[PDB]
Design a protein around this ligand. Structure first.
Ligand SMILES: [Mg+2]
Ligand SMILES: [Mg+2]
Ligand SMILES: [Mg+2]
Ligand SMILES: [Mg+2]
Ligand SMILES: [Mg+2]
Ligand SMILES: [Mg+2]
Ligand SMILES: [Mg+2]
Ligand SMILES: [Mg+2]
Ligand SMILES: [Mg+2]
Ligand SMILES: [Mg+2]
Ligand SMILES: [Mg+2]
Ligand SMILES: [Mg+2]
Ligand SMILES: [Mg+2]
Ligand SMILES: [Mg+2]
Ligand SMILES: [Mg+2]
Ligand SMILES: [Mg+2]
Ligand SMILES: [Mg+2]
Ligand SMILES: [Mg+2]
Ligand SMILES: [Mg+2]
Ligand SMILES: [Mg+2]
Lengths: 290, 138, 109, 25
RNA sequence: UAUUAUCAAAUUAAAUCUCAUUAUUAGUACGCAAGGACCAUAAUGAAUCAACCCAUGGUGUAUCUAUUGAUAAUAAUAUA
RNA sequence: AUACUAAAAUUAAUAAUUAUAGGUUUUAUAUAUUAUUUAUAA
RNA sequence: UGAUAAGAUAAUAAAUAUGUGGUGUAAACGUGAGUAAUUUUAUUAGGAAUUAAUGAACUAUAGAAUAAGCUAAAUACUUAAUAUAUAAAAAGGAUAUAUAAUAUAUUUAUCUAUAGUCAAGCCAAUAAUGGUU
RNA sequence: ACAUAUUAUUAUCUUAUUAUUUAUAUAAUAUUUUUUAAUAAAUUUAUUAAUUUAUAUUUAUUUAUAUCAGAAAU
């Protein structure tokens, strides 16, 4: 039905194809071998009728997961069930673990924090499920730009949402987030100022061992209008816009940084027609808070 | 269908192997045929020789070439006997199973699985014991 | 079923095919049967068309004729396509010869 | 049958040997 | 009981008229026990008769295919 | 329908309706090769 | 740790042999049907075709244990790395120290090579009940 | 006069299984190769399903030989 529903259907088909035995795929997903499948009549689990021929599976686009993220499951744990089923696959299956991308996990964190609201459970799952990703020779899933930055933004808005003046636990959250990263794509430099904003908000000295002290380097977003490319253009730096707005709202001093403001207005122009993701996120958080 | 002096196979473990029909029981004209599932009077024309290794041989066989016995025709080679569903089944060789004169239950204890196909009409006539014993009922 | 034996369809049942007539469980308590097509009887009326099937179960040969349009069969599926060496339209001549059907069920397993 | 052919071949060989023995005698 | 087309009752001649097994009543009545009902009903058949070819088997000097031996012919090609 | 009879169907060709047999067309049956193939073009 | 409790990591203490693996049932026990012997038995200071790139399984010595795939993973299986005219090999588990999975030391395991022990294949000579109705 | 049975052989027939033999398959698997499409990636590659070249193992049919067992004969 909705984009999420079709995305779930395609993802389930992708998973089932990549979870079958290697010697059984040629007899199931290859149409020419339909007669062979009918004749052999393999015994499937749960003592049911032998499998019927199935259409072949082609590589899946990230937009399907993005749609599935953008689908609304405010009080439904479907996101948690899908993550569990996806993370339970064998390490050797490269396709399943190579479909996950930094934008994907960043979107999971964002949707979990605003729309689903139960950010605690999803962040616990994602942070806990890291060793298997590392064994899957896929450490780039966790990066400063997408994973760590989104986590810091969620921490900022969580502190804003619920008052917590216990600085020690906040420092522990920051330290665990810092150690959980693997690829360390610290290029925009927003992480350093985000941690400074967290320190000012709570009152603890920023501390990020090994952090690269790069300044704010946000490339200029063109204000031109295009078709599907424009959609991507905004989404490309949408998170960046979310980070900038959270910094501006939480930190009053953030108005000093003119680069963040320049990025904001550029994005705004490039997005004047459509609704602001930041305001929409706040409205969804407020509506779904109860 | 079989008539007087029609040699027909026996597919029971009662020792008898070949039998020759002498009469049809539930028929008026002796020249009428014997269909699948009607009692017939047979005289055995071939039997398996008997041994004496086991004292008090079981009365399952009690068959010697020449003895008179009653049987039920279980399968036939005729190809036009139509059923209600419209299908027709024709076998390769006719066969029968010996049954007791009075009680009606078969002499044998188990039909042999290698030649144990029986027409399904026999079940509708009420011969549940033969159908249950038969390996496959077509 | 008309397209299963349609004369204009290449992939139609012909003499030499081996089929498994499936009997509707709900409508009847029959059992599935496997046989070798000896003849496909076609009559002026479409409904009264039947298949003649042979199978040598163990040491007994069983011929069965089944109305193809009876409401007691849900589907007739093909197991082994016919060979391109038998030279006739109805294979009545295979009985008793070395070309006979033999035991189909055992060969499948 | 191959059994018959083998038997005939053997018999012919042995009859030839017997004839050879008779001629030698 | 004075036409034609059609529909036609009484009547006359003749055909048919059945029988068995099982089940219920009921293991009831009767009987120490063994054994085992009458009255009646239904279902299966047997024998005889009539009709029919949708389907099944036979036939099918309609027709098609395969094939051994011999002979003859049409067309194309080469030659005169 | 029938031994010959008898019965039954048609004998329309006009302002409108009517098919008896043969032939023709369509569909179907039978026979037995055919997807390695039938008709067309690009 | 997980901002609120579902999951996750380490340690400790337990359960699971209806999942995947390993190992043993070529022995022992019982019997005497067949077997009159081109194949069986007994004996021989017997023998060569000159009997295995054989170890089944302990001892002595020396060396090695590498990469992928499938299975959920594996000391399961397949394919590859090098090796006594070449070819042919494997496997890790547990326990304590230190680095940020690795190196150590112990213990039990895997594989190859030589030798020994146990153990094997084949042949020869002599004997092995009665009936020639 | 004649009856049965039990055993053994086959120039005989049937046959389970197995073994081997002459070939076939637009047969399956994996490599390589000439191609056709869809999808995915970043904005040229890969996956999937097909299409020719062979490669190694199987699958099904077929030619032939031997074979438990049964029948027939002696
Ligand atoms: Mg032969
Ligand atoms: Mg009248
Ligand atoms: Mg009356
Ligand atoms: Mg009468
Ligand atoms: Mg007829
Ligand atoms: Mg007809
Ligand atoms: Mg017919
Ligand atoms: Mg006819
Ligand atoms: Mg006229
Ligand atoms: Mg007409
Ligand atoms: Mg007209
Ligand atoms: Mg006409
Ligand atoms: Mg186990
Ligand atoms: Mg032993
Ligand atoms: Mg003995
Ligand atoms: Mg190794
Ligand atoms: Mg191993
Ligand atoms: Mg002989
Ligand atoms: Mg054979
Ligand atoms: Mg033999």
């Amino acid at each position: 039905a909705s984009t999420g529903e079709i995305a779930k259907a395609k993802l389930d088909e992708f998973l089932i194809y990549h979870k079958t035995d290697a010697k059984l795929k040629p007899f199931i997903y290859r149409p020419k071998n339909a007669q062979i499948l009918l004749t052999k009549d393999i015994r499937d689990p749960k003592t049911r009728e032998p499998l019927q021929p199935r259409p072949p599976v082609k590589p899946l686009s990230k937009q399907t997961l993005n749609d599935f993220i953008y689908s609304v499951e405010p009080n439904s744990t479907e996101l948690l069930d899908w993550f569990k089923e996806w993370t339970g696959t064998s390490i050797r299956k490269r396709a399943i673990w190579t479909y996950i991308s930094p934008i994907h996990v960043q979107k999971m964190l964002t949707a979990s924090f605003f729309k689903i609201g139960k950010y605690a459970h999803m962040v616990g799952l994602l942070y806990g499920i890291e060793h298997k990703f590392l064994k899957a020779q896929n450490p780039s899933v966790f990066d400063i730009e997408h994973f760590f930055n989104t986590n810091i933004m969620c921490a900022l808005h969580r502190n804003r949402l619920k008052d917590y003046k216990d600085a020690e636990i906040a420092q522990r959250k920051l330290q665990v987030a810092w150690k959980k990263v693997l690829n360390r794509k610290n290029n925009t430099g927003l992480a350093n100022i985000l941690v400074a904003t967290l320190g000012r908000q709570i009152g603890f000295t920023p501390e990020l061992t090994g952090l690269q002290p790069v300044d704010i380097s946000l490339p200029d977003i063109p204000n031109s209008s295009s078709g599907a490319e424009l959609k991507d253009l905004l989404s490309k730096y949408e998170g960046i816009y979310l980070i900038a707005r959270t910094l501006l709202d939480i930190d009053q001093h953030n108005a000093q940084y003119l680069e963040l403001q320049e990025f904001i207005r550029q994005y705004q122009n490039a997005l004047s027609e459509s609704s602001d993701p930041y305001d929409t996120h706040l409205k969804a958080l407020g509506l779904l808070e109860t | 269908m079989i008539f007087l002096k029609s040699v027909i196979k026996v597919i029971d473990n009662s020792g008898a192997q070949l039998a020759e029909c002498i009469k049809v029981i539930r028929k008026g004209s002796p020249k009428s045929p014997a269909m699948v599932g009607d009692r017939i009077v047979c005289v055995i024309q071939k039997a398996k020789p008997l041994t004496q290794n086991i004292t008090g041989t079981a009365n399952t066989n009690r068959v010697k070439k020449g003895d008179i016995c009653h049987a039920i025709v279980v399968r036939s080679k005729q190809r036009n006997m139509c059923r209600k569903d419209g299908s027709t089944v024709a076998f390769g060789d006719t066969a029968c199973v010996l049954i007791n004169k009075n009680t009606g239950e078969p002499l044998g204890t188990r039909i042999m699985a290698n030649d144990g196909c029986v027409d399904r009409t026999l079940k509708d006539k009420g011969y549940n014991k033969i159908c249950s014993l038969a390996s496959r009922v077509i | 079923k008309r397209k299963l034996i349609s004369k204009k369809n290449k992939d139609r049942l012909k003499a030499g095919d081996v089929v498994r007539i499936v009997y509707d469980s709900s409508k009847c308590s029959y059992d599935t049967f496997v046989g070798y097509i000896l003849s496909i009887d076609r009559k002026q009326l479409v409904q009264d068309a039947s298949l003649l099937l042979r199978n040598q179960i163990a040491k007994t040969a069983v011929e069965i004729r089944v109305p193809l349009f009876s409401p007691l069969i849900e589907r007739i599926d093909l197991l082994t396509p016919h060979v391109s060496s038998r030279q006739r339209n109805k294979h009545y001549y295979i009985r008793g010869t070395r070309l006979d059907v033999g035991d189909l069920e055992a060969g499948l397993r | 049958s191959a059994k018959a052919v083998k038997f005939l071949k053997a018999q012919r060989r042995k009859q030839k040997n017997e004839a050879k023995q008779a001629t030698l005698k």
